[model samples]
Target: NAMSANDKLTILWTTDNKDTVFNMLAMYALNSKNRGWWKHINIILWGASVKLVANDTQVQTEILEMLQSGITIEACQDCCENFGVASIITNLGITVRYMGIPLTEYLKNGEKILSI
Candidate 1:
């Protein structure tokens, strides 16, 4: 499937920046609902952010909202265990994976990415 401006959005949340992650997820989740773009959406939570979210209930809850909104969240397991809170994130419905070609194969198959 060629992308062709289909707005196949991919969001990368890979920072320790709490506000950034919240705002991005908050907005995207709402937009996907209001604008009805939840059909094909991907969210990647990597690096320090996963650790932060795993330990922080507020952050985790917000992310859970996004997940229930049909957002596919891929949390990096390395970061999850490095912080020793992988279960928290997994419990919130975020898919825990070591390394995946999700972003790669998605784009190769015509998915647009917006790394926040």
Candidate 2:
């Protein structure tokens, strides 16, 4: 089944407008499997979404779900370290890698990508 298959979607979010982006992305991904979007999802939180960890409990819950669903969550290394969410985010089983590594990897692999 497509939902069970090993597919990946790479998402790059770089907006300070966290309310809409975070909520929608979470909601969208929560339903992605039922909607048949991708079997696995990778979300790269580079810019402002880093703050969402503490800012929005709703978004955070969705993020936790992403982690549970095996979605790879990559926070920009510097930002996560600076903001001190690395331990917290990683504790949820998300991979907090340097941006370059995941960015380059996805670039080479042709994963579906979105940037805004």
Candidate 3:
């Protein structure tokens, strides 16, 4: 019943490590979707992750695959601007926006979240 319920999963990735990005975040997000582990999977890039996404070509490609795999990816606008990668992240087809309110909404609404 709970599995059939409208439960959403949010993964807040804050680190800049590429290994973790490919091995952990990307793996989990993609597999979770492929296996139907939840109703939805949303990846939220925060902090240094924004810059990593901006600069890493391999990560860029991998993230594109994730996007096509039905994972809605978004990045923190403030982080993007602070890291000088706002335009790049936007061009990646990633939604760049203020994350504070939306993140709080997830927390307050009992949505499941995984942070790294």
At residue 34, candidate 1 shows an lDDT of: 52
- Residue-wise C-alpha lDDT for candidate 3, range 1-116, written one tens digit per residue: 36534657889989888888899989988988878886589999998888888999999998899898899999999998898888999999999999999999988978778998
The CA lDDT of each predicted structure is 0.73, 0.73, 0.88
Off by over 4 Å in 3: 1-6
Off by over 4 Å in 2: 1-6
lDDT at 44, model 2? 85
Report model 2's TM-score to 2 decimal places.
Answer: 0.76
Residue range 1-116, candidate 2, lDDT tens digits: 34543476667867657666666676676677546678777788887778776466776777777777666677888888888888876765666778887688778866688775
Q: Any residue pairs clashing in model 3, and if so which?
A: none
Model 1, 8-111: lDDT tens digits are 56767777777766676567665786578656577787877777777777887777677677767788787788878788878888888874666578668666
| Structural similarity to truth (TM-score) of each candidate | 0.79, 0.76, 0.91
Per-residue lDDT, model 3, residue 76, is 94
Q: Which pairs of residues have clashing backbones in candidate 1? A: none
| Ranking of predictions according to lDDT | 3, 1, 2
